[PDB]
Design a protein around this ligand. Structure first.
Ligand code: SF4
Ligand code: SF4
Ligand code: SF4
Ligand code: SF4
Ligand code: FCO
Ligand code: FCO
Ligand code: F3S
Ligand code: F3S
Ligand SMILES: [Mg+2]
Ligand SMILES: [Mg+2]
Ligand code: NI
Ligand code: NI
Lengths: 267, 551, 551, 268
């Protein structure tokens, strides 16, 4: 038997699910056939409608106290929950019901971790984080927009293999992935130190791989593993290595708040 | 009649409810409802025009890249910026590779379980399954041994009692027509698809900086630094690596996905005669290759009342006829202002009042083109290409028809493309033609860099006073996308996205005319109203994306 | 009667010359010569013991890892260091994965073109070729479609007129016995082998820091920092990535390489009765799993006069019987000091004087064990494992024999393993058993980390006075390897490597006794003395590595 | 369609430089030899041996005069009239000079051919020298490392094929895309160096947090290369420092094989 997972999307863009389709360890096919039993996921489920709601209800009962609950997207509280309705009920109700029997609860992505883009600006829907809707529960936050999928997958694997979550920081983020500032482990730090800065995309410094601080890099104020784990497992691929500043998408108050070219504060 | 609701519709992006009235086992009327809103248009307002693309890209992660690219095109339009040709090549490679992943995942992971019965695959003979493909495909992974391995994976999953994503599927439903062997083949291909789509996104990642959600755009071009001799930038080694993944895509696309599309049509020919959503079709040209945001590799146009011979070509993203025709209404949507609005003057003022059959019932707006309902997406884009006499499109369609004719003895006429299966076929044709786009644009990039052009970015200036308006068009995997930006005193004063699934999924409009999803369902046979598989088959053919539709 | 020279021998590592006297169409006498020397033993002298491994790893890049590991074991032996068990698991995974790459490349890239005629593959029927493997292999890439694609690649290469490394091969030679279909199957597998070996080396790289030439060792353990919760170090995500590659190796090894081995024996059974190199065999135990450099997963031992029943087990790398038996002579080698030398007292003083049939003719020394010539390598290690009653080895050999039985109606006895084909078989059996070593040691590492042991390194101390002698044994892909370090006044005062290909390729010894290569060739039929394919067949079976042999 | 010819000669090589090709992905070795080049001579992979293969070489040198790329791995030993490497009865130095005469481009792959490498270190028993030393009148492109990432070589060959000239080179004739910068001037552990966060011994608390390896002997401050950016094996995150071991300076003459692992680098 494989450990059960229930995945509910709230105000999600599906990018966090899509991250799984880039993963290699495990690939999404090995995740769903070998690693876990994905008991509810609306993107992939054969069943729809009343049949898939029956699957969820049956799984919540059969696996009570055993499943990992995962949520992507923010949860909208304005106007009594009506900005996300599934099977005629506010998604916040579905989430609180599923949370009652969960062994572990994960907020995958910046939206569920801290509200993310959906809670930015004027916040039209009163979008909030998963932790905000589950005050009695310890929610493990795996931020990023979307995170590298293995930030999630190795968190799940730690729960499965060793029986507990990975070590967390004071935002309940796994330290293996979020324990250090990007700027405190960035390969362009020597250029920062020397005052070697790209000033515009396509300029001479930019075309030599110089530091992107003066383009608005938010590496100095964003915790993450983007410079080390990077993305897609091909080698050498993260925003800064491709030539664009970090936007701070991991980090509340940075991504989706600060402008791309706004300068970060440096510690 | 009987009233049913399908909520949630699964194997789509996002939150969709479909309601149907059924008279004597035939759908007589339907309602499509997007049930989640974020207000992404309001979120992006009052910011620097340069910032919009990073925010509005998050409209959707399935069609990642698309809103990023439309947004920068919209700001570039407002500012009158001509994008460097190397930035076009890079944008084009990203869009084509992304769309390759998107279409493959749609056919297999999203749609195949409408047509394929996994329990029937357990009864298959793997050797007979393999023999069925002799002379039909040259794919290297159709052996009995491959199929036995796949069969055993299914067997092991069923034996565990933990069916997960496969639990309570429509196994043994009367509308499942494939023989055991063909069901087994399809499951093998579903798994093999996952490898191909992963390679497509490796292309995207190497230029975008990651995927989902690329990070290499700018208003004025791209952030990739082209320098063949540079350490840590887009050099020849990196370009070679990108090419290595481009080269891995074609065989699966041509020898698996294209073939499976013909075969599904061969076993389900009734589905060439239902699911017509509209009589008008729109697509925009795509893949610009000159220094002035034009010279598109794929053509666009407008077809009215299904008449390909009288269609109107669209060859520019600044076409005033296209721009002036687009409006959206909220008469039957949960917004306050109901009369048709041009998007530069659009509002998005929420006004939720619950479901009413005759009133408001969706967060999706209702777009029209000069007052008509229009279907967008791969059926539109295929029909426009056929209307344009694009040989590449006609030839690719003819390859699908030739396989279909080998299996059935029948041909396919254009009339039969206005249907659920025609929509699927258009998508497959698109994916196939996109492989040549990738080769073409990689070669263009290498050649241009070789002439000494390393330019990628034109720094914009944004006047601090004045009001000006821009629109960025893009032919997305699900159809024509437009982002509409108004800038006033240097910041975004209006932002409206009109997205392909908005055209297709929108509710009844200001004149109570029915949109494509709703129209397509009229006439659908429903054998078991508790398990309306037939309704979902037609809806999935449109590749719904409700984060896109509603934003 | 005539004298031939084969210089260079290709499809080996390094620089080898083979001379043969042929009489009555059979080789009557042979000479093996290593024709390049570097003086790696001298280069490393007078350095810090901790530095040696990075220098002497460069003895060989085909058997990369092996000299690095033997060197740290030698320093650890001199210093009386017990290696942390996590460091043993990591060292073991690297050696097992490396050896998997190494053996696969030997069977396909290095040896197959002795047995396989690519020209004949052009005449094959791909469908008949595929049919031949029904019930013989479950490999998923044996379809006629795969084989047609491969045949077209060969066709296109021949059509270009640029055969390159396939040019002037031994096409149509009378000793080429495979049917066209089997030649095609082999070329398809040759290409597939390249993907599997790449995956094996991804395992190596993730722990070694790169490959070729790993960089994670130390005298005292390893440089990998184990911390499941650490960013930038060996955490659970990195371990999962390693496992993902370990899991990709088995199917090719079991369903292609293992089966091809049985098939080559079935078509070439005469090669079970030729190429015996010795009557004595040595291997060392390998893959230590305890906290004191022992508890090996694979056993070692010494067989004298082909008697398995009375073999002497070797269970420790500190076994004085093994240590005291080993000597090398340079009587027929280009060094000054000729009498047999124990390696702690060894010299390597060059004394080149050109070729002489009865004098010095090689840069390879001549090793003996208590004065006897000994074969090392996969034949030795299989025979010792059979002598030990190791069930895993018996069972794996039996699988190969059962395929041979099915194809021929004949069985294979242990007497037939003392042969060119037996040698190949021992290598294949080793590769197959190594996949369980990988699964075992990965699981042991995960489990031990879970107990709270993250220890990887114990910092050594090296007394600044005193003289200390250490020896590091390792069962390399080509056989027993040993590095012998003497430390005096804190620096390396003598360093001697005795390498498996030294044992096998070494020239006539102090008593003019013939080494395994030279012995194995006596009796070889040679149909065409200008194109002595049969000699190269037997020589390749030993997997020569002359940078290793000579250093 | 005809493929550009390549002649590869190994001198005092360990074969690690050829073996790097077997890790390559863009192109893979099978695509290299079937699609990108015509590998006219390579003793590791050649079907032909002995007289037949020397015949391939002589024929190719004549047929492709002025057109082929010559590649050499290993150092070239000059002591005692070249006898420390003899192929087909003749010193490898002579085979190399003969092949150099008709070459369109000449590449020293690896530190041994680029500058002598490990084989020339210590007392240099065989008088091993670099390829450029044996070919004083020729421009030799140096691709150092022990072995280099194979794409440092493959993208150099690709530049020659696709654009008709070598890539841009530094003053040691090393391609700037791979060797243009010190490792320490593009190392992700630089923030730790800057803060004085150093590992002191393998397995210690700092080391287990991914801190800077300078005090373990890291030679990144004196070694030009792309090891921290391009890294190795195309899996992501794999180079010696990322794995936990200092750079040894294997790319760089006077550093690798000269300085102790734990000897400290000079910082600029
Ligand atoms: S975190 Fe980002 S990728 Fe994930 S749901 Fe939110 S917007 Fe989408
Ligand atoms: S500002 Fe950004 S690019 Fe520069 S060193 Fe810091 S994280 Fe790296
Ligand atoms: S550079 Fe290194 S890998 Fe290449 S031949 Fe020399 S020792 Fe071997
Ligand atoms: S000393 Fe080495 S590990 Fe530290 S920053 Fe420099 S190159 Fe990186
Ligand atoms: N494709 C796509 Fe998403 C939708 N609908 C957009 O644009
Ligand atoms: N295997 C190997 Fe190399 C040899 N001979 C060593 O040790
Ligand atoms: S924008 Fe996000 S993905 Fe990483 S590089 Fe910055 S935290
Ligand atoms: S030892 Fe060599 S491989 Fe790179 S990290 Fe240092 S130059
Ligand atoms: Mg809108
Ligand atoms: Mg020796
Ligand atoms: Ni979308
Ligand atoms: Ni070797």
């Amino acid at each position: 038997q494989r450990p059960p997972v229930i995945w509910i999307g709230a105000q999600e863009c599906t990018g966090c699910t899509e991250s799984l389709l880039r993963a290699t360890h495990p690939t999404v096919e090995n995740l769903v056939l070998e690693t876990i039993s994905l008991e509810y996921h609306e993107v992939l489920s054969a069943a729809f409608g009343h049949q898939v709601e029956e699957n969820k209800h049956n799984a919540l009962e059969k696996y009570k106290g055993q499943y990992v609950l995962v949520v992507d997207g923010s949860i909208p509280l304005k106007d009594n929950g009506i900005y996300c309705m599934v099977a005629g009920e506010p998604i916040v109700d579905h989430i609180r019901k599923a949370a009652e029997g969960a062994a572990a609860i994960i907020a995958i992505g910046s939206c569920s971790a801290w509200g993310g883009v959906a809670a930015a600006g004027v916040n039209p829907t009163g979008a909030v984080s998963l932790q905000e809707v589950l005050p009695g529960k310890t929610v493990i936050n795996i931020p990023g927009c979307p995170p590298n999928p293995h930030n999630f997958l190795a968190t799940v694997a730690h729960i499965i293999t060793y029986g507990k979550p990975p070590k967390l920081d004071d935002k309940n983020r796994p330290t293996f992935a979020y324990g250090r500032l990007i700027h405190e482990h960035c390969e362009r730090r020597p250029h920062f130190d020397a005052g070697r800065f790209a000033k515009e995309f396509g300029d001479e410094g930019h075309r030599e791989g110089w530091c992107l601080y003066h383009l608005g890099c938010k590496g100095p104020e964003t915790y993450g593993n983007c410079s080390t784990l990077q993305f897609c497992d091909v080698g050498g691929v993260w925003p800064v290595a491709i030539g664009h500043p970090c936007y701070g998408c991991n980090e509340e108050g940075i991504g989706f708040h600060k402008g791309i070219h706004q300068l970060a504060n440096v510690e | 009649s009987q009233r049913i609701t399908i909520d949630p519709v699964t194997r789509i992006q996002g939150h969709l409810r479909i309601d149907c009235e059924i008279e004597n086992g035939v759908v007589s009327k339907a309602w499509a409802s997007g049930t989640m809103w974020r207000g992404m248009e309001e979120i992006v307002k009052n910011r620097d025009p340069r910032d919009a693309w990073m925010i509005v890209q998050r409209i959707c992660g399935v069609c990642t890249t698309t809103h990023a690219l439309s947004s920068v095109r919209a700001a570039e339009s407002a500012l009158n910026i001509d994008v460097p040709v190397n930035a076009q090549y890079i944008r084009n490679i990203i869009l084509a590779a992304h769309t390759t992943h998107d279409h493959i995942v749609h056919f297999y992971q999203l749609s195949a379980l409408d047509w394929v019965d996994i329990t029937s695959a357990l009864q298959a003979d793997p050797t007979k399954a393999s023999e069925m493909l002799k002379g039909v495909s040259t794919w290297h992974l159709n052996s009995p041994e491959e199929f036995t391995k796949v069969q055993n994976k299914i067997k092991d999953l069923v034996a565990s009692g933990q069916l997960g994503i496969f639990a309570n599927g429509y196994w043994g439903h009367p509308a499942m027509k494939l023989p055991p062997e063909v069901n087994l083949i399809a499951v093998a291909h579903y798994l093999q698809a996952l490898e191909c789509q992963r390679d497509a996104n490796r292309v995207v990642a190497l230029l975008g900086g990651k995927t989902p959600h690329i990070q290499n755009l700018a208003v004025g071009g791209v952030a990739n630094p082209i320098n063949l001799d540079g350490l840590g930038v887009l050099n020849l080694e990196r370009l070679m690596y990108i090419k290595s993944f481009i080269d891995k895509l074609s065989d699966f696309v041509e020898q698996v996905y294209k073939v499976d599309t013909a075969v599904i049509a061969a076993f389900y020919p009734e589905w060439l005669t239902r699911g017509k959503g509209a009589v008008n079709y729109l697509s925009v040209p795509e893949f610009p290759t000159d220094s002035k945001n034009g010279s598109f590799l794929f053509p666009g146009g407008y077809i009215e009342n299904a008449d390909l011979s009288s269609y109107r070509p669209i060859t520019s993203h600044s076409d005033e006829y296209l721009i002036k025709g687009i409006q959206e209404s909220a008469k039957h949507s949960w917004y306050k202002d109901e009369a048709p609005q041009a998007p530069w003057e659009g509002t998005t003022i929420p006004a939720y009042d619950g479901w009413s059959d005759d009133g408001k019932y969706s967060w999706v707006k209702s777009p029209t083109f000069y007052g008509k309902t229009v279907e967008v997406g791969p059926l539109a884009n295929m029909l426009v290409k056929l209307a344009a006499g694009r040989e590449s499109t006609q030839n690719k369609l003819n390859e699908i028809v030739a396989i279909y004719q080998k299996l059935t003895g029948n041909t396919l006429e254009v009339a039969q493309l206005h249907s659920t299966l025609g929509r699927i076929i258009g998508r497959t044709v698109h994916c196939c033609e996109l492989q040549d786009i990738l080769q073409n644009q990689y070669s263009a990039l290498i050649t241009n860099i070789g002439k000494g052009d390393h330019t990628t970015f034109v720094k914009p200036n944004i006047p601090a006073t004045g009001e000006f308006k821009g629109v960025g068009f893009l032919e997305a995997p699900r159809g024509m996308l437009s982002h509409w930006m108004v800038i006033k005193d240097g910041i975004i004063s209006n932002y409206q996205a009109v997205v392909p699934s908005t055209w297709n999924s929108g509710p009844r409009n200001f004149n109570d005319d029915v949109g494509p999803y709703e129209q397509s369902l009229v006439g659908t046979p429903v054998a078991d109203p508790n398990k309306p598989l037939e309704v979902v088959r037609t809806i999935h053919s449109f590749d719904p994306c409700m984060a896109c539709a509603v934003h």
